[PDB]
Design a protein around this ligand. Structure first.
Ligand SMILES: C/C=C\c1cc2ccc(N(CC)CC)cc2oc1=O
Length: 133
């Protein structure tokens, strides 16, 4: 199933601290954000995605079409410009964010009814798991 539509509530968050530190998020912001539980609202229509991640402190939005490279300004996080491209590797949705940081991107997939989001930057990998609400 390649269907990420819906509202998703975080159940687990592994190594979010490492990912944020790899992005150079300022200490105070990072210390608060590592504590947070996130909710995702995903609108998926063909290749068109509108994504909205929310918490009490850090909110992140991205819109894209699969297979269409786009400029992303990561102003809610590290405030960098990346050239982002989201494509399918099987049923895994894969984003590569080309720019200053090496190995920067994310992957997302459904397994056992749960949504998995893997965030990478540098040598850090963060794994988040969400249940469908
Ligand atoms: C799956 C597509 C939409 C979607 C992509 C997405 C990408 C990244 C992201 N984060 C890292 C900057 C915050 C946890 C959250 C996201 O949330 C989404 O809903």
């Amino acid at each position: 199933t390649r269907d990420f539509n819906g509202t998703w509530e975080m159940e687990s968050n592994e190594n979010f601290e490492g990912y944020m530190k790899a992005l150079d998020i300022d200490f105070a912001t990072r210390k608060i954000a590592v504590r947070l539980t996130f909710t995702l609202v995903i609108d998926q229509d063909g290749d068109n995605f509108k994504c909205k991640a929310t918490s009490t402190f850090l909110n992140y939005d991205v819109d894209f079409t699969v297979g269409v490279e786009f400029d992303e300004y990561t102003k809610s996080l590290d405030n960098r410009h990346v050239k982002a491209l989201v494509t399918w590797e099987g049923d895994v949705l894969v984003c590569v964010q080309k720019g200053e940081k090496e190995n920067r991107g994310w992957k997302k997939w459904i397994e056992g009814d749960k949504l998995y989001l893997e965030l990478t930057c540098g040598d850090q990998v963060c794994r988040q798991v969400f249940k469908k609400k």
